[model samples]
Target: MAESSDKLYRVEYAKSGRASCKKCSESIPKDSLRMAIMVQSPMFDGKVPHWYHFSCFWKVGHSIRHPDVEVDGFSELRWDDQQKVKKTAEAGGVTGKGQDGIGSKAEK
Candidate 1:
């Protein structure tokens, strides 16, 4: 149950094509809204970065104790989309059930 600092989560717009969503394995289109999560890796020494789509951000086990901030391209998102991101972050990550769950209704 580790929580990130006030700047733990970063909402930005994709610049070039390089990273993909860790959860869905989909190409994060350029100029698309994306979220970057700071993660610590055992093999690595420093904080490794994990990228995910706004919706997929909640699929991982991370909580935003603080409000999310817009970094670069986050402002490009529509008003409703921005709210979606906010609400998802407020969820403190996804559940181990539903289509995102393992060995659940999705794998049938």
Candidate 2:
């Protein structure tokens, strides 16, 4: 059987300020890390998708984007309301889908 994926992390937005390592609190250079949000896609062997850091990806490269990111070391998934957030995302809606779509009023 294939291995299980680990916790995911999306990049902290500029509005969120700079992101630091949870361990050392060192500022992570944006260029040094690749940022992406999670997804529940059929492409990942039926695993929940999540954001990742590129440097972390190199340390443990996998078929996915960055294997070194150590998705397993991340435990935030089960710690807080992450599950609830995920479920809400899965539920899907137009809550904050934004207005940049093809015919969104905001687009005009």
Candidate 3:
């Protein structure tokens, strides 16, 4: 069987500081690598990345399988950072229903 779709979760260094992490709700640092899951948004011409801080992401219990970032951005990350994301994804193993929890919010 094939995966649900061709798209995959993405990882990249931030091109700008405008994006706030979906985890902490703080703006991601420019030049710091971040995590992304592309989802639908009527505001954008195509699917948009729901971004998250790398640390905040893993700590929050989201799942990341095989991932890549080149066109939407990345090829600029250091080798260590690239490997970090790759290994991190691998460490989490595999997951299919990531959004069941991803859609949940922490309310206080």
Candidate 4:
């Protein structure tokens, strides 16, 4: 089973700045809901983070799951976005589908 130390996931309101979405190469406007995943990196003393717009993450099929990873600031999101994060987290990927919601079957 995956544990929290291996990776971390978060949903938070972005501060007053712009950040590029790694997946789509688009701007994430300030105050928008953003998702971040932090993973251990051998080159860094601490974990490295990747930021994404919530939709972009889903569109690109990025999933990082750890039993300990809890999505924070979820309630701050709009109801629909909240559901999106909740469902994706619960499935550890995409709901009712395989990796990134591409295939109908879940990968083992």
> Per-residue lDDT for 31-72 in model 4, tens only?
456766677778986765577776665665656554224554
For residues 28-103, could you state the per-residue lDDT of candidate 1 as single tens digits? Answer: 6555556776667788866656777666766765666544352223466677866766676576654432223221
The stretch of ten residues in a row with the least summed lDDT in candidate 3 is 99-108
- TM-score, every prediction: 0.56, 0.22, 0.61, 0.55
After best superposition, candidate 4 residue 58: deviation in angstroms?
1.1
Counted clashes in each candidate structure: 1, 7, 0, 0
Model 2 spans with C-alpha error above 4 angstroms: 1-17, 22-25, 30-33, 36-53, 65-108
State candidate 4's TM-score: 0.55
Model 2: worst 10 consecutive residues (lDDT sum)? 96-105
> Which residue pairs clash in candidate 4?
none
Off by over 4 Å in 1: 1-7, 69-84, 91-108
What does the lDDT read for residue 105 in candidate 1? 25
Q: How far off is model 1, as Cα RMSD?
A: 8.8
Cα lDDT for residue 85, candidate 2: 34
lDDT of 3 at 10: 57
Candidate achieving higher TM-score, 2 or 3? 3
TM-score quality measure for candidate 2: 0.22
Task: List per-prediction Cα lDDT, in the order shown.
Answer: 0.58, 0.34, 0.58, 0.57
Model 4: CA > 4 A from native: 1-6, 63-68, 72-81, 88-108
lDDT digits (tens) for residues 1-108 of candidate 3: 243223545567666676777866666666555776667678965566778776665655666543563223445567897777678767873322222122222311
